[PDB]
Design a protein around this ligand. Structure first.
Ligand code: A1IKU
Ligand code: ZN
Length: 257
């Protein structure tokens, strides 16, 4: 029964998920002055040309665009990673207002939203096994700011009417996630967690420095989604972000100077 409300939100999650107070929780504030350039990170490789999107789902917490992850089709490699990580889904976190919505922050700045491209390490065979390992997942995080429209997002925006409420899905084939990337792949990286329950400490985070721009109309449509199921009282799907957690004994590394 966790969620984002006053009585079931982030401050309550630790009761059912004690790892919420663990040693490598996400998100975090990225202090740009304290992050250290690491000249050894290897180049980062996003290989999405053969991606096969399948479906879009409103799961009651966000919406997921799901991919075929039964073969190496859309993979993330390089950067801080050893081995090959397959794209399983992407989703967003966003605010009720343009001045909040991101999970990570940059020098305490909040963005309007944050895109998470979720990948799992093929050495563990399936996603469910991967989330049980400290190097099971690699999540590419991309900030959204409100300005110019993002053309490659509009297909997502357009389908949201058909998945308004929890449990609804729609076909979503032939979507190209390359259309959601910024120009630069400069990034910060650190070891962390899932940002929702079960909050498992299985993620290598790779957060891009360059945001993407989306229009006010695009983010407005995200805010028309519902947390509730059909035929239940309407609760707008907004503010589905966890705030920054303690960094504890971690260092954030930068791929750039
Ligand atoms: C199952 C799952 C996958 C990814 C995430 B997140 O928000 O950390 O990308 C949370 C939960
Ligand atoms: Zn997420």
């Amino acid at each position: 029964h966790w969620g984002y409300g006053k009585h079931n939100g982030p401050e309550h999650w630790h009761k059912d998920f004690p790892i919420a107070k663990g040693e490598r929780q996400s998100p975090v504030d990225i202090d740009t002055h304290t992050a250290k350039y690491d000249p050894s990170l290897k180049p980062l490789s996003v290989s999405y040309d053969q991606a096969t999107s399948l479906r879009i789902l409103n799961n009651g917490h966000a919406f997921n665009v799901e991919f075929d992850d039964s073969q190496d089709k859309a993979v993330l490699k390089g950067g801080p990673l050893d081995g090959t990580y397959r794209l399983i889904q992407f989703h967003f976190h966003w605010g009720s207002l343009d001045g909040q919505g991101s999970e990570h922050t940059v020098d305490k700045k909040k963005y309007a939203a944050e895109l998470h491209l979720v990948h799992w390490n093929t050495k563990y065979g399936d996603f469910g096994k991967a989330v049980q390992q400290p190097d099971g997942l690699a999540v590419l995080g991309i900030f959204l700011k409100v300005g110019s429209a993002k053309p490659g997002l509009q297909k997502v925006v357009d389908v949201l009417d058909s998945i308004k409420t929890k449990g609804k899905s729609a076909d979503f084939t032939n979507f190209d996630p390359r259309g959601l990337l910024p120009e630069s792949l400069d990034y910060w990286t650190y070891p962390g967690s899932l940002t929702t329950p079960p909050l498992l400490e299985c993620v290598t985070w790779i957060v891009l420095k360059e945001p993407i721009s989306v229009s006010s109309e695009q983010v407005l449509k995200f805010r028309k989604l519902n947390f509730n199921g059909e035929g239940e009282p309407e609760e707008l799907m907004v503010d589905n972000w966890r705030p920054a957690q303690p960094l504890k004994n971690r260092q954030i590394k930068a791929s750039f100077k």
